[PDB]
Amino acid sequence: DDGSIDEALVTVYEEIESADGNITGVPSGFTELDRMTYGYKRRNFVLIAARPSMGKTAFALKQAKNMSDNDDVVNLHSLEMGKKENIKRLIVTAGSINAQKIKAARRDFASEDWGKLSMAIGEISNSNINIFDKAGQSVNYIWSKTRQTKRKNPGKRVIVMIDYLQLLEPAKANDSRTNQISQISRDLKKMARELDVVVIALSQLSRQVEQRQDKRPMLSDLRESGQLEQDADIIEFLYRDDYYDKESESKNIVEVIIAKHRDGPVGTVSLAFIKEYGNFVNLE
Template structure:
């Protein structure tokens, strides 16, 4: 090493930061001395992230050249890597052919490559952890007292993401046959859906499984909140841990809707309060109070909800109950991103939120059900029926969702329609089953949707 070494500063600070340059050299050396009999590149690549795991910049450059050759099924020995670096103009920057030979001379054995790669990755995670803590301290010094909660939530989201360590997906990359018998054994048992809607025909078609994101969309006053709140109550009533993020309605409004739904008390009377609530109403509410108090139903009325906050709430409930929750988000276009970028367009913001929610669902095993608004496209269409392309602000929602339910009511446009009191649930996308249209009854005075058969039954 000399004063002209491009990484002299990195080497001098090696002792001050978490790194093992010896492990990095050992892994790269193994790749530079690979033989057809054993491929250490694949073993190392299964552990190391695509970029950023290397402490020394010239090690990162060499690794990218190795990956480029390996991806083309070419040898990764010193001559080939030297030629690749010369082609990209990076050879002199990494120290020339002499440096490559020095690294090759310090190679670990081929069977040790993965172990040393894990050490390199572990140190990289430790550095990211240190950097996250430093950013947290900087944010703490600069945060306004009124924004402390937002700052903590953003920092917590960053740490949660770091803890997930998405670069190592052990168990997700395997030979097809390795898990085949286990899957065949699982087919002998009926798999219960991870979440239900409480509507018989919709549950038959829409099988919501862990990791699914389902979008419930419609124009204003179509019953999105009534439907998703009904889904929350159906799941909580069945014993499933359920979480509702209400971004549009406050505690009082949501509580009145729950009481109207479960106690069958007119919502308008509850909203008015006082003498409008009759003795009969109070009797019905009193009968339902024990059940409502015992429901595994959690409400979050936080006005500024980000994917990071959703992840935090899910993990907290999972630890508390031992069960990944069913999550209701009302509604997705009101959510913020964790980055809080002021110049983000609505399209970019909703797209980022959608991608993050999909990742969160897959990470945690939760089922996430999002309300979403539609644009005015359906109102200029004959029949007024909505389509998936009407989703407002982002096509990413359509891509990420496992299922999309579009709500439509004829009587919203034609008060004298013979289908007054009916709602169409258009299952426009369904990865786990068929697409179809299901008719239910809306009872908005009770803030709920009901199966057509059940809506005609006498309820006491």
């Protein structure tokens, strides 16, 4: 294994001729974000960070299903929620069913929504969404499962989604908190690279965001982590203006703020958020 660039040099040039304007990598399914990125690349470590109530989980699951629809394979590592809980959200979003009606009282509170439910259960059943809901998971643990998934899926690009990074078991229990998050971050990127997968980690943000006038997240908000902004190729913040100002002129808009982009443009992408369904609508 020398450092020969010859075979890489030809594949790069080949990809340039193939560059017709369509999405190369794995699509998020949000048109205008895929325009900026051209899809997630087999090596990418992407971070979705937001304060509570900005739509983070809904947004990640939306993506998960959108990628599943390209027939890519999604491994969701959900440390916060059980599979049951993830699956109900997936159903609610897919079939445009209401969460309270479904929550219980589906046996009565539901109309002719059963065609939707069976349509929705059909789609989730024939999807490439895996869920790993064990409360305690290290990157090592996730490494193991990603390979295991790779082996069981031939030519398929795997996407590793982590329901929130700061819940992961750090490698060294006695390390400082910052060092633990630093290690988790390095290892997640190494895993993305070494196994050749997209890693998508959800991340919380400092509550200090909210004792600012303008509560749009910035890169400095990733305080308690440090390493996190350095390792990620893509960092998408979510901000929902009408959580903060109740007569915002941006009612029901979630903006995806691309705060870091290694191989491309930064900027903001707005989406219409359908609260009741945990769905997102592309804007022009």
